[PDB]
Amino acid sequence: GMEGPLNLAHQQSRRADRLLAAGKYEEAISCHKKAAAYLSEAMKLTQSEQAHLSLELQRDSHMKQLLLIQERWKRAQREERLKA
């Protein structure tokens, strides 16, 4: 049903795993960047410091994912050229 920004951040995070497993690196990075943007929105709605700190760590986790996926994408791009 209904979707607020935290629900959308979680939806993008689920979609990013699907796309990365399919070898769709760029699309997976975009989902992690969208999830971080939606978390930035959800962080404006927190009423407690524990919820705020936890959403901030969740957003940073998407940044760590972006770095990992970028590195893996570069490796897959080089492999693609090597095998063509």
Identify the burial level of 1 via C-beta atoms within 10 angstroms of its C-beta, where 0-12 means exposed, 13-18 middle and 19 or more buried.
exposed
CB atoms within 10 A of CB 44: 9
CA dist 69 and 53 (Å) reads 24
Contacts of 55 (CB under 8 A, 6+ apart): 6, 39, 42, 43, 46
> Strand, helix or coil at 84?
coil
Are 69 and 29 contacting, i.e. CB atoms less than 8 angstroms apart?
Answer: yes
Domains of the chain: 1-84 (1.20.58.80)
Q: How far from 25 is each of 5, 11, 76, 77, CA to CA, in Å?
A: 24, 17, 9, 10
CA dist 17 and 39 (Å) reads 17
Are 62 and 33 contacting, i.e. CB atoms less than 8 angstroms apart?
Answer: yes
